[PDB]
Design a protein around this motif. Structure first.
Motif, PDB file in Angstrom:
ATOM      1  N   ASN A   1      45.827  37.592  39.661  1.00 34.94           N
ATOM      2  CA  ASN A   1      44.752  38.524  39.986  1.00 34.94           C
ATOM      3  C   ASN A   1      43.430  38.103  39.356  1.00 34.94           C
ATOM      4  OD1 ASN A   1      46.515  40.018  41.506  1.00 34.94           O
ATOM      5  ND2 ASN A   1      46.735  41.684  40.018  1.00 34.94           N
ATOM      6  N   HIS A   2      43.460  37.635  38.112  1.00 35.71           N
ATOM      7  CA  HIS A   2      42.220  37.380  37.392  1.00 35.71           C
ATOM      8  C   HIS A   2      41.582  36.029  37.710  1.00 35.71           C
ATOM      9  CE1 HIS A   2      43.877  34.566  34.326  1.00 35.71           C
ATOM     10  NE2 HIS A   2      44.997  35.237  34.534  1.00 35.71           N
ATOM     11  N   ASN A   3      42.174  35.203  38.577  1.00 29.35           N
ATOM     12  CA  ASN A   3      41.467  34.019  39.072  1.00 29.35           C
ATOM     13  C   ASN A   3      40.429  34.337  40.157  1.00 29.35           C
ATOM     14  OD1 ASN A   3      44.697  32.888  38.923  1.00 29.35           O
ATOM     15  ND2 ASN A   3      43.153  31.938  37.598  1.00 29.35           N
ATOM     16  N   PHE A   4      40.451  35.539  40.741  1.00 23.23           N
ATOM     17  CA  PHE A   4      39.529  35.906  41.819  1.00 23.23           C
ATOM     18  C   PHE A   4      38.375  36.717  41.239  1.00 23.23           C
ATOM     19  CE2 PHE A   4      43.777  35.708  43.811  1.00 23.23           C
ATOM     20  CZ  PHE A   4      43.558  34.708  44.744  1.00 23.23           C
ATOM     21  N   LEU A   5      37.170  36.134  41.246  1.00 27.62           N
ATOM     22  CA  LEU A   5      35.932  36.861  40.972  1.00 27.62           C
ATOM     23  C   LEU A   5      35.431  37.505  42.270  1.00 27.62           C
ATOM     24  N   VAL A   6      35.439  38.831  42.305  1.00 28.41           N
ATOM     25  CA  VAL A   6      34.929  39.598  43.430  1.00 28.41           C
ATOM     26  C   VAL A   6      33.749  40.399  42.920  1.00 28.41           C
ATOM     27  CG1 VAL A   6      35.418  41.284  45.211  1.00 28.41           C
ATOM     28  CG2 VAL A   6      37.209  39.692  44.473  1.00 28.41           C
ATOM     29  N   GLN A   7      32.593  40.215  43.551  1.00 28.33           N
ATOM     30  CA  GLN A   7      31.345  40.824  43.120  1.00 28.33           C
ATOM     31  C   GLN A   7      30.719  41.585  44.275  1.00 28.33           C
ATOM     32  OE1 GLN A   7      28.852  38.462  40.434  1.00 28.33           O
ATOM     33  NE2 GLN A   7      30.054  36.648  41.056  1.00 28.33           N
ATOM     34  N   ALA A   8      30.320  42.826  44.005  1.00 31.90           N
ATOM     35  CA  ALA A   8      29.618  43.682  44.950  1.00 31.90           C
ATOM     36  C   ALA A   8      28.252  43.975  44.336  1.00 31.90           C
ATOM     37  CB  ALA A   8      30.409  44.952  45.237  1.00 31.90           C
ATOM     38  N   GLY A   9      27.238  43.237  44.778  1.00 30.53           N
ATOM     39  CA  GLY A   9      25.945  43.316  44.134  1.00 30.53           C
ATOM     40  C   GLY A   9      26.002  42.832  42.697  1.00 30.53           C
ATOM     41  N   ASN A  10      25.814  43.740  41.746  1.00 34.60           N
ATOM     42  CA  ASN A  10      25.817  43.389  40.333  1.00 34.60           C
ATOM     43  C   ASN A  10      27.113  43.770  39.639  1.00 34.60           C
ATOM     44  N   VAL A  11      28.046  44.390  40.359  1.00 36.71           N
ATOM     45  CA  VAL A  11      29.285  44.916  39.802  1.00 36.71           C
ATOM     46  C   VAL A  11      30.418  43.950  40.117  1.00 36.71           C
ATOM     47  CG1 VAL A  11      30.973  46.787  39.963  1.00 36.71           C
ATOM     48  CG2 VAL A  11      28.522  47.296  39.929  1.00 36.71           C
ATOM     49  N   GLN A  12      31.182  43.567  39.101  1.00 33.28           N
ATOM     50  CA  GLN A  12      32.387  42.777  39.323  1.00 33.28           C
ATOM     51  C   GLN A  12      33.544  43.727  39.590  1.00 33.28           C
ATOM     52  N   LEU A  13      34.359  43.391  40.585  1.00 31.49           N
ATOM     53  CA  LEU A  13      35.527  44.186  40.933  1.00 31.49           C
ATOM     54  C   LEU A  13      36.762  43.591  40.267  1.00 31.49           C
ATOM     55  CD1 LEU A  13      35.078  45.097  44.785  1.00 31.49           C
ATOM     56  CD2 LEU A  13      34.024  46.095  42.734  1.00 31.49           C
ATOM     57  N   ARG A  14      37.637  44.459  39.779  1.00 34.48           N
ATOM     58  CA  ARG A  14      38.904  44.002  39.229  1.00 34.48           C
ATOM     59  C   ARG A  14      39.904  43.897  40.368  1.00 34.48           C
ATOM     60  N   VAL A  15      40.383  42.684  40.625  1.00 37.74           N
ATOM     61  CA  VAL A  15      41.507  42.488  41.540  1.00 37.74           C
ATOM     62  C   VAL A  15      42.801  42.869  40.826  1.00 37.74           C
ATOM     63  N   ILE A  16      43.631  43.678  41.491  1.00 37.71           N
ATOM     64  CA  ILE A  16      44.876  44.209  40.948  1.00 37.71           C
ATOM     65  C   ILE A  16      46.059  43.901  41.867  1.00 37.71           C
ATOM     66  CG2 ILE A  16      43.672  46.018  39.635  1.00 37.71           C
ATOM     67  CD1 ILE A  16      45.057  47.894  41.987  1.00 37.71           C
ATOM     68  N   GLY A  17      45.863  42.988  42.808  1.00 39.27           N
ATOM     69  CA  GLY A  17      46.897  42.614  43.738  1.00 39.27           C
ATOM     70  C   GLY A  17      46.336  41.652  44.758  1.00 39.27           C
ATOM     71  N   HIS A  18      47.159  40.708  45.218  1.00 29.97           N
ATOM     72  CA  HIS A  18      46.759  39.754  46.235  1.00 29.97           C
ATOM     73  C   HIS A  18      47.951  39.444  47.118  1.00 29.97           C
ATOM     74  CE1 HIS A  18      48.467  37.252  43.091  1.00 29.97           C
ATOM     75  NE2 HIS A  18      48.633  36.287  43.979  1.00 29.97           N
ATOM     76  N   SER A  19      47.653  38.848  48.263  1.00 28.78           N
ATOM     77  CA  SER A  19      48.599  38.771  49.359  1.00 28.78           C
ATOM     78  C   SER A  19      47.913  38.088  50.526  1.00 28.78           C
ATOM     79  CB  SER A  19      49.084  40.176  49.709  1.00 28.78           C
ATOM     80  OG  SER A  19      49.589  40.258  51.009  1.00 28.78           O
ATOM     81  N   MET A  20      48.659  37.296  51.280  1.00 25.69           N
ATOM     82  CA  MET A  20      48.144  36.523  52.401  1.00 25.69           C
ATOM     83  C   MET A  20      48.731  37.092  53.682  1.00 25.69           C
ATOM     84  SD  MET A  20      48.269  32.379  52.641  1.00 25.69           S
ATOM     85  CE  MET A  20      50.039  32.286  52.860  1.00 25.69           C
ATOM     86  N   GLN A  21      47.880  37.321  54.683  1.00 28.54           N
ATOM     87  CA  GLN A  21      48.330  37.716  56.017  1.00 28.54           C
ATOM     88  C   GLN A  21      47.739  36.734  57.022  1.00 28.54           C
ATOM     89  OE1 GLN A  21      47.413  41.702  57.299  1.00 28.54           O
ATOM     90  NE2 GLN A  21      48.101  41.309  59.397  1.00 28.54           N
TER      91      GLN A  21
END
Ligand SMILES: CC(C)=CC[C@@H](O)C1=CC(=O)c2c(O)ccc(O)c2C1=O
Lengths: 273, 296
Positions: free
Chosen positions: B61-81
């Motif tokens: 989860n913590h290898n993915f940096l997800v940013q919405a404007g100035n806020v970083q989002l915490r990824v808490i799950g991942h999955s491929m479809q």
């Protein structure tokens, strides 16, 4: 190449419906003022019905500025972006958010034609739709739509209500002058073709500004200004093609033919971005 | 008649920036899931023959940096479809519009919100070409830009941008990660099939030409459906089908011009050209308005 409009999100949250008696058009709600065409009164605050979605706004003051009606209201618009009121010159481009009775319908990219009209294409009730540019989160409002001209094109004002072009907001027979082609924008778009892949239209010849303008005016092309040459100098540097040699490609292109027509709604600035 | 894109505000509120190591794309934040192209987990190597299940099993989860404007989002799950990555996050997106996912067909239209590094940059209107590509206008890192339609404030997402083809056009998937056309998210020698004109869109646009002013292209003739297709496919026009004829029925009614008459008109136009004349506001036959668009 695709023309793109600016994202319309910041302007969408400013669009209201403004109704005076039997007539309804769009208005622009920034801080505690709603801007709209004065044509809506064809008065004290109470006969102005202003609706922002499901709410109604209470006009608490009215005021005219040229051909724009300024409606003061009880609440400031919490969706107001950073914004400037500016006035553009023929040949510059901007995006229009067409609206119907308050509801944003679509968005498209324009050029202010040299005869001060825009080839827009408009919903039945798009009066008071605005045109804008966005730079680094700042909305530059530059156009408010008023009328369709008998020839299918459109006429409007800046957001201080000054008309672009020789038009009045009365129902007199008025017609667009002869529209010309925005020469400096065709040249940018030919630079963009070489900055991409296309370079078949290039030639080994140059031409003078005077000899190009005499060729140009006969095909109804705007004359080319020594400032127009300067502005296109960045693109001459990026590609190695002098402006007067691109003009020889344009002069020859104006006599043999071969998109498949020459685009004139990309400014030089547009091409650099 | 200006082609308009849909107002882009409802999609602007959903764009984010997704980073994995050294790879930054655009992602689409809806409720508590960020969608993006799985190619974001590829590196320098990898691009030629990536094993996405292998590279994904190796990710936390913590290898993915997800940013919405100035806020970083915490990824808490991942999955491929299929070819789309789906990151679960902390926070539902407060700006999530009413939405759905749909898969579109060649010849249908939609708007694309082109973004860089998560910030929207422009919106344009689009048709899915018959060969399943897009003639987009993409800045450097527009990947993950999404395509969509809006109907009564409901956003139907139908396209996500993945790649640019060696010929200058663009390939992508629906929001369930299935590619449009025969393309793979892989740096191999793949080419767009031969592009053809969307015939049913030109005929709808010709009817729009009649409902407005112009009738100059009309003529006395009619044609059979088969005879029409034999001529049109010689100009790389898509065969017209009974379905297409049925679909044009409404506009035929509103104009009292029969579909096969309009077809005969188009045959002549393809034979003659414009003679420097103009139909709606174009010296080119326009094939990115659908019969559905023309009514509205
Ligand atoms: C597909 C091809 C012939 C060449 C490029 C390929 O390597 C690639 C695939 C991809 O899917 C992708 C994205 O999805 C997003 C950005 C991005 O650069 C890419 C890619 O370059």
């Amino acid at each position: 190449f695709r023309k793109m409009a600016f994202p319309s999100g910041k302007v969408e949250g400013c669009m209201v419906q403004v109704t005076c008696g039997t007539t309804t058009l769009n208005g622009l709600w920034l801080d505690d003022v709603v801007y709209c065409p004065r044509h809506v009164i064809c008065k004290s605050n109470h006969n102005f019905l202003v609706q922002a979605g499901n709410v109604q706004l209470r006009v608490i003051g009215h005021s005219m500025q040229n051909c724009v009606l300024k409606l003061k209201v009880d609440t400031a618009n919490p969706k107001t972006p950073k914004y400037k009121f500016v006035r553009i010159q023929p040949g510059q481009t901007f995006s229009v958010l067409a609206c119907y009775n308050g509801s944003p319908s679509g968005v498209y990219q324009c050029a202010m034609r040299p005869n001060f009209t825009i080839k827009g294409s408009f919903l039945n009730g798009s009066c008071g739709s605005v045109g804008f540019n966005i730079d680094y989160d700042c909305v530059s409002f530059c156009y408010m739509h008023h009328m369709e001209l008998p020839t299918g094109v459109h006429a409007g004002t800046d957001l201080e209500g000054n008309f672009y072009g020789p038009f009045v907001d009365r129902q007199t027979a008025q017609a667009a002058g002869t529209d010309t082609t925005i020469t400096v924008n065709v040249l940018a778009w030919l630079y963009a073709a070489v900055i991409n892949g296309d370079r078949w239209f290039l030639n080994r010849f140059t031409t003078t500004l005077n000899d190009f303008n005499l060729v140009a005016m006969k095909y109804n092309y705007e004359p080319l200004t020594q400032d127009h040459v300067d502005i296109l100098g960045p693109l001459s540097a990026q590609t190695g093609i002098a402006v007067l040699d691109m003009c020889a490609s344009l002069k020859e292109l104006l006599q043999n033919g071969m998109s498949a027509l020459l685009e004139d709604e990309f400014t030089p600035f547009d091409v650099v971005r």
